[PDB]
Amino acid sequence: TQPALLRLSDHLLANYKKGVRPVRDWRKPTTVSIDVIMYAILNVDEKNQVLTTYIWYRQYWTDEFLQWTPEDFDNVTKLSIPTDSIWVPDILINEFVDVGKSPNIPYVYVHHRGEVQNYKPLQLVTACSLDIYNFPFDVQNCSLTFTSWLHTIQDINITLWRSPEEVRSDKSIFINQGEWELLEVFPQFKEFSIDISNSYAEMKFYVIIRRRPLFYAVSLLLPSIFLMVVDIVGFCLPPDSGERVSFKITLLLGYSVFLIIVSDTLPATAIGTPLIGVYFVVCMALLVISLAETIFIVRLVHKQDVPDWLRHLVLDRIAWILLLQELSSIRHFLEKRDEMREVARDWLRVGYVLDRLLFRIYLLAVLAYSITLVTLWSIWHSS
Amino acid sequence: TQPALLRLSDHLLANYKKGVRPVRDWRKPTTVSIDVIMYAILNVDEKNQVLTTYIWYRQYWTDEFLQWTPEDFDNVTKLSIPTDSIWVPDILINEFVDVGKSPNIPYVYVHHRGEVQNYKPLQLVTACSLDIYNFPFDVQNCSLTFTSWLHTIQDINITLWRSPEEVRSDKSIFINQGEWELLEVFPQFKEFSIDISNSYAEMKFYVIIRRRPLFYAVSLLLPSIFLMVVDIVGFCLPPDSGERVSFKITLLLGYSVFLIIVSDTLPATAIGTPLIGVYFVVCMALLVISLAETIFIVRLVHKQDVPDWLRHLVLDRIAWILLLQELSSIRHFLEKRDEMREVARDWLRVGYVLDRLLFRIYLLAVLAYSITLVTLWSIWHSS
Amino acid sequence: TQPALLRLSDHLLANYKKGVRPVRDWRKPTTVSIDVIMYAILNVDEKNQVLTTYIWYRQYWTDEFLQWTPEDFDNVTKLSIPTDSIWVPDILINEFVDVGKSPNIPYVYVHHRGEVQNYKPLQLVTACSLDIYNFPFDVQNCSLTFTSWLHTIQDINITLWRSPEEVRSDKSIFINQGEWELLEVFPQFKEFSIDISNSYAEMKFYVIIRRRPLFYAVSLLLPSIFLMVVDIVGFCLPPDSGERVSFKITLLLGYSVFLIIVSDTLPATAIGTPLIGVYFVVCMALLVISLAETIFIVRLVHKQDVPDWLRHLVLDRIAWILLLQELSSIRHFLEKRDEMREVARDWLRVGYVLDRLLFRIYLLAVLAYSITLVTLWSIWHSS
Amino acid sequence: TQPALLRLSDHLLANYKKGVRPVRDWRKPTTVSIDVIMYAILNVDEKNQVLTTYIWYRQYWTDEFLQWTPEDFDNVTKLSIPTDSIWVPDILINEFVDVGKSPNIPYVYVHHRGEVQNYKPLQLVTACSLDIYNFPFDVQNCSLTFTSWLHTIQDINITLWRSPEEVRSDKSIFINQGEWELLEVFPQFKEFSIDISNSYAEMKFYVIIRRRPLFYAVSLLLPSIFLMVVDIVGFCLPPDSGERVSFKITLLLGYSVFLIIVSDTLPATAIGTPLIGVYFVVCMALLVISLAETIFIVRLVHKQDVPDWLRHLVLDRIAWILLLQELSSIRHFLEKRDEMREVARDWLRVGYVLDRLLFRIYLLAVLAYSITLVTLWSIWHSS
Amino acid sequence: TQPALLRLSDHLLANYKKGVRPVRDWRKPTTVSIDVIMYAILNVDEKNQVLTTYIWYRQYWTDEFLQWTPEDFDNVTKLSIPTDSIWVPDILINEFVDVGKSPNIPYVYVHHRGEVQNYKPLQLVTACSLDIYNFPFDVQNCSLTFTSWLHTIQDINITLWRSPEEVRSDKSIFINQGEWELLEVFPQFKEFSIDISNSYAEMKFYVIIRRRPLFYAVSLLLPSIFLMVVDIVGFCLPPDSGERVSFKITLLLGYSVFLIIVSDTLPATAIGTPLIGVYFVVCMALLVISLAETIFIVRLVHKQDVPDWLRHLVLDRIAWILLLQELSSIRHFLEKRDEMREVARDWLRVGYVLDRLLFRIYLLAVLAYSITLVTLWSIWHSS
């Protein structure tokens, strides 16, 4: 006598058709459960609005023809079969824009009551809407819809194998060391008809993820905050100090390089914009502004007199704030060291006033930036 | 009795030939409808003049041999068949320079009157002429011609399944969050003969898209406009102020870095050129120009006298604008502080005049830039 | 008479089934030994937390049906068979997120007692937790779990072919010239059940590797240490020396560029952070700090008097440290060269004190950096 | 009666052998015409010396066995056959280092007299010698040899389908918007024998292309020419003007960044070198040279006297060009303002002479650069 | 009568087995000659220690079953057969870490005495030890071992087809325009046993290559040498000249950018280091050193007196080298212009001495660099 593992495999696979749906009455569908686990988050391309994941996609369904009596064959109740030798459902992710590179599992299991169990390490790449407004603290609701491309609901009703609560909690297999965390995955059924009789079963999986903003924080914000503080203290100087002006130039160069670094190297998609680079743009803007202002005042150090305009403007401004003759050749030579103050000094002083006012409001800008930052931190920690 | 889903699949696919065109009289073609939907715009490579899209290409055609009487088989009127087990038309996009990575749909449908329904998530990559003249506000008319590579019109007449108006309006499935929008897709039939009897049916699809210039605007133009304004105000200074000249040097460094950033990081193909970097090149040019001019004047501060040439030139210029002796040792020591003005001052003043004239016209250049910008905005919003 | 190499190949492969597990009694598993060698470490992507290796994966198992009597066939005891013509186990690496590009070995060996010997140059790509805390001196414990995706332990018990000590020592085939070294590979068996009756055999291989930090050392740290030393010596200067302040600006630019270079070009994942760039951030921070301080003092050179606050603060500070009249016009003109010291000098001196205190503690920071460096060196050499 | 399209396909493909060369007398070859069209120039990698093209490769040959009498079968004279069901020639491009990604055309045509017509959108990647001497204006003669890898001339004689003049003129299908133009494609037959009896037919296709140097011109040369002009005018200054020297430093920084940008971002292979970056290297060199010279002179401003050496050298140089006592304390204090000229002035003047001589010859260098540029333009326009 | 090309192909391929080794007595191996030609050197990745080549791998071996009598079949002595229809040896390159993309040759030849001739354009990618010590002038001995992965020497003895001298000289087919040259390829047989009875034939091919250092020379060294010379001449200045110090800062910025460019853009693996960047690191180091020294001296310009320490140190140093009263108010006001020299001058002079000593030894460093360079040139030209 032969092995029953041969005799049964000879029985079940002979006179079988991989194309014909495995059912005796066509009017019934062949229902298909699934189960999804997130092994890891391989990569997140914020620019192209796509996602890279690796999952352990299980699958279960029934085949009327893959049935036997265990007692007739060695009391056997399971059997390995090649997946390519039987009918298989053409499940497909709606967001699957590009083919996933993953190895084909050459076998499946079968039970003595038509059941089938196909597991595989499905790797996938999908599209997703990615918000960059909270760029370090970004949290997403990327989706994974599961369905047949063609087979209607009347042939294939997608279902779930595990219970949904069990699915959301399941973090049995995950690599936390990645840049991106994972919070849960909510499954939900849906029916989908673009037009009549095109009913298609569906099973959405609201994948949720959270970024670890530590690295971005230390790498980006703290250098920016140091730049902010050096601008803050640089404004303390008196305007026509020349290398006060060159110091604002130094800060301009640093801010320029950093602002450049943002979309040089850091992810910044075209849709929307993050507020962080916005605030940095603003601070650089105010820097160059008062760079021009102290330069204006430096021109005004040279005797130059528009003081009427200036004067009523500062009034409204602060309203809104609410032989011996020859040895006196040498005397005059001395006092000419600062005799030009009689014109230079009014404009010098009011320029100093501008410097300090502008300094206060720039400080307020940096304050708003920090407030926003702490708000985003709290929101990130909120879930 | 067996299942009719088996008995009919056994009937239809036995004694079938995938190669032979599915028709009884060869003189007739096998007409093929299609339908096209734009799931998304994955990427746009402005440099290589190509496009990346993901579409839901449907397809319909008739097969004389895939016919049956429903009553003979379980009153059945539909059936799933493997796509690889029957004749298929070799439709192919003319612009399809590189193979699209997309998964093969292993099944199709068939009706009891020879009809076939093949749907698939065809991903594709094509060439396209891309205008960069309106770089942020670029709007394109990229095409997708559909045809058989070989089969003549006498075997295969391409058609359309839906009506064209329905097709242009259809944005049922699209992801607006991408960098690129989508306006519509115009279908149109065409016949194509390079030479006689090589008639080939065709079906063009004038894909239309629109960029969201917000990110590029904030990231590029506003920094550039701030650079423009600091140059504007820097020109207010008097020429031989030394760090006026160093300030123009600072602006030169910033403009250099930015102009470099343009084709460093921002898309800029070799065909044509965008006007934005053009205007920036111009403003940098005028900056370095008057950097040289104030330097020229600084040399002229040193006593140096070509004032005849200068003098008739400024005339035509403004025409076109239309013991006690020893204590006077110390007196002369004092007045020698500015006795050199007798030569320095004429050249100093006319240099100041150059600075201000050049400042006005540079302002006009920046004005033209802004006018152009608003024009492009209006054109972008026009459709 | 024909060749026996033909007659036996005709005997063994006819009436064979690639799908059926090669066994006579299903209740027994088909045990599978393995053996692993590390040809090379192709690449290590610290960012994406993955690994690239090339290995010589051997494999051994038994087939009850691939049995013969050597005497009946030319006294033959070995035979080459195509691997695609027989049953094969579906071994698969758990961390195998992306398919390895490797060539298929078209043949195997078989012995006259059911034994099989399949060797292949399996290339693979896996995930791994990668610590960057000791960025140059990083040492990892990346893993390679081996198992069947589906087949339970009751069908397939993974084992080892060689002995484990022999395996760990084996560096017969390895390329030491790569960036990454290799220390050993520890094999270990494991059983794995997510839930009941889902027992799956496993065989982990704790791959160990060590970086050669020479290049990173010379390329990164020594330039940084030179930057550190120039800041050290720059602090020796007196505060209101103007280009002392510009020298700190120079160092700020250099430090900025280098700190930028770190995550520009050098690997720096998002999880955790290396201490090296941390220390560099700190030194840059102290530089910009005292840049602001000497600037503050430069403002204070201008007559300005907050000296009460300063004075009790420095007290607590050092507690914690524990006609002739007209020719005297010219006399006063002379002595006015430094008559402003009466106010400038106290603030100047205490600013000098700040410079030197801050210099000492910055020196201590650089000291801690060097201590850490030597510690990591010793740890690296420790194994 | 069945369809003749079935009956003939049943006749022709039964008892056919895809491997056997389709011929009755082996002594004759099976001649093969071709035809080549350039759809587009996808990319040109100047570094790796390769080329990316997309072509419409037609092909024609005879099959003695694929013959029928039209009258016997529906008066039919054409027929679609799957390409994979018949003999095909193994044509292969000699420069085809890397496999072209292109879709397989699943059908061909056949006529009733053994003729076959296979068209396909062959995409390819080849090697090519690429001259960068005229980097913007580069024009190439990249080749595409066509042949069988194995089949000798005695089995396969390559030929041409169209006439060669028709082929060179044909630009029916081409996309001019690419960076690269196309001028023509010259076909030519060749016989090729490395050694005796290894005669192999061949069909070379001298693809010709021309770059559109507009973008490179505006993006590279004009900024460089502006740099040139600012150096030109900067040399007008007198040497020991300090920020003359700092201005040459500014230009040095700009030139450095640009020279870096060249092989940073612009294509520059290792074989040979373009003259454009050469000229830029030269101008930067002369800048740093006279930067050192004005620095030398600045040291010489300090009293320092080598004037004998200098003096005979300038001779040969220009040969080759072919109480009251106390109020005179204050008098001497005044005249000491420039009493150091008695030594500073000779060296100052001769340094000025060096500045101007060096300025003239640097101007000549820039002149040569421009002359070369116009020459290359004319050559580019020449064909 | 049929064609003999059909009748013989029908004879030879019927009753054939692709798996069984083509031999009548198993005790003999099936010996396999080869031949190798280097079409081109596609790419060399110095970082990953790999190589990219394109070769024309021929192959020859015998098949006992593919034998016929020419006279019985049209006096035929050659025949084209599909390669996939017969036994083939599983030759494989030991260094073949990643699969080569190359097209499959669908045919082979066969002669009437069992001989087979398979040619193919094998493309490959391998690992190789790459020395970067002579980075521009690097010359390698990269290897290509050929063998069967499995089949022992007792089944397959690798051999060579051509003679070895003929093989080393053969440069019939090569593209010299690439970055990399080729000198020769030495073939050599080897036997290989990790352990007993695992004898495996082998055929190593010591590929040799040489870089064309022209581009790297002009692009890297000459700018570096110009930097060296400007530092050389900058050291001529007197120390407390302020923009001497700023000039060393300029050179520091340039050197920094260049040193950064090295491993930014130029290949620099982690194993070992090139001496060129080493020398550049050294010169930058000495620059920043004496930048600090002139800064030290500038502090010492301020009256400051450690001159005892300095004095005995310079001794050992050079040992190792082996009313009227009021008008004298104005007199003293004058002479106070340099009365501070009484302390400033000793320290100033000895600082000048340091500058010049350090200048000499830095010159020596640059000298050593140039000597090394010429040495490497000579070595490169040596073969």
Author numbering:
A (entry chain E), B (entry chain D), C (entry chain A), D (entry chain C), E (entry chain B): 8 to 312, 317 to 333, 402 to 462
Anything the authors wrote about it?
Five protein subunits are arranged in homo- or heteropentameric pseudo-symmetry around a central ion-conducting pore. We report the structures of 5HT3R reconstituted into lipid bilayers in the presence and absence of its native agonist serotonin (5-HT).
Thus, unless stated otherwise, the main symmetric apo conformation (referred to as apo-5HT3R-Salipro) is used in subsequent analyses. In the apo state, the lipid-facing M1, M3, and M4 helices of 5HT3R-Salipro are significantly tilted compared to their positions in detergent. Helices M1 and M3 are likewise tilted by ~15° and ~9°, respectively, yielding displacements of ~7 Å (measured at the intracellular residues C243 and L307, respectively).
